Amino acid sequence: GLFGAIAGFIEGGWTGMVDGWYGYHHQNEQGSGYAADLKSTQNAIDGITNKVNSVIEKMNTQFTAVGKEFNHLEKRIENLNKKVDDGFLDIWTYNAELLVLLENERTLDYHDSNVKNLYEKVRSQLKNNAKEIGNGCFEFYHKCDNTCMESVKNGTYDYPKYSEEAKLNREEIDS
Amino acid sequence: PKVRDQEGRMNYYWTLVEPGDKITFEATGNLVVPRYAFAMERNAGSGIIISDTPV
């Protein structure tokens, strides 16, 4: 969408990832599996709850005014009452429909941004030590055990630690 | 005009009596005096609904 990740360069979702909104799938010698990214999921849940709260909290239930009754010599004020009732109804009906449409578009873009930001954080870390193979996936030029995988999911990944390894494998296929 | 077998008409009136206030009646004819009056206190959130829905 607006950020090109969801239904973009990451074509589809992960039905097998049930414990979070965004995150990772890994595969190495120890094992594989989907794992939710806590930080992005936790913040996004707070944001959407705030967004829903900011729409409904001020929509407190109220006491509807009495339906007025008018006689045959009160058509003018009867029509004025009808104009008042119709005027308010049109505004709330039009605004509520339009507001939800606009909000829903931002909600999807918000999820799109969070995926893209999550992808960029990993890409900014690995650099030459991994190959971007599309669909939001990275192929390492070095062995990355379970401990190494969490460092990427942490913002801690040590590029020089695996640089000497990854450099040799990279230039091996480069030659 | 004869309505419900009656060429005459009767007009029905109403008023409210404040606490500590006297209401006086005086007539030489054509008076349909009250018999049962009502004492009341306003609630707030109430209204009138026109419907055929069962209760």
TrEMBL record, chain A:
Q: Where is this protein localized, as stated in its record? A: Host apical cell membrane
Q: Which family does it belong to?
A: Belongs to the influenza viruses hemagglutinin family.
- Quote the subunit structure annotation: Homotrimer of disulfide-linked HA1-HA2. Interacts with human CACNA1C.
Briefly, what is this protein's role?
Binds to sialic acid-containing receptors on the cell surface, bringing about the attachment of the virus particle to the cell. This attachment induces virion internalization of about two third of the virus particles through clathrin-dependent endocytosis and about one third through a clathrin- and caveolin-independent pathway. Plays a major role in the determination of host range restriction and virulence. Class I viral fusion protein.
- The protein's name is Hemagglutinin
**What is the protein's species of origin?**
Influenza A virus (A/Mexico/UASLP-021/2009(H1N1))
Q: Which residues of the full protein are shown?
A: 326 to 499 of 534
UniProtKB/TrEMBL annotation, chain B:
Q: What post-translational events are described?
A: Palmitoylated. In natural infection, inactive HA is matured into HA1 and HA2 outside the cell by one or more trypsin-like, arginine-specific endoprotease secreted by the bronchial epithelial cells. One identified protease that may be involved in this process is secreted in lungs by club cells.
Q: Which domain of life is it from?
A: Viruses
Intracellular or extracellular location(s): Host apical cell membrane; Virion membrane
Family the entry assigns: Belongs to the influenza viruses hemagglutinin family.
Known function: Binds to sialic acid-containing receptors on the cell surface, bringing about the attachment of the virus particle to the cell. This attachment induces virion internalization of about two third of the virus particles through clathrin-dependent endocytosis and about one third through a clathrin- and caveolin-independent pathway. Plays a major role in the determination of host range restriction and virulence. Class I viral fusion protein. Binds to sialic acid-containing receptors on the cell surface, bringing about the attachment of the virus particle to the cell. This attachment induces virion internalization either through clathrin-dependent endocytosis or through clathrin- and caveolin-independent pathway. Plays a major role in the determination of host range restriction and virulence. Class I viral fusion protein. Responsible for penetration of the virus into the cell cytoplasm by mediating the fusion of the membrane of the endocytosed virus particle with the endosomal membrane.
Q: What does the annotation say about its assembly with partners?
A: Homotrimer of disulfide-linked HA1-HA2. Interacts with human CACNA1C.
Protein name per the record: Hemagglutinin
Organism, as annotated: Influenza A virus (strain swl A/California/04/2009 H1N1)
Covered part of the full sequence, start to end and full length, is 235 to 289 of 566
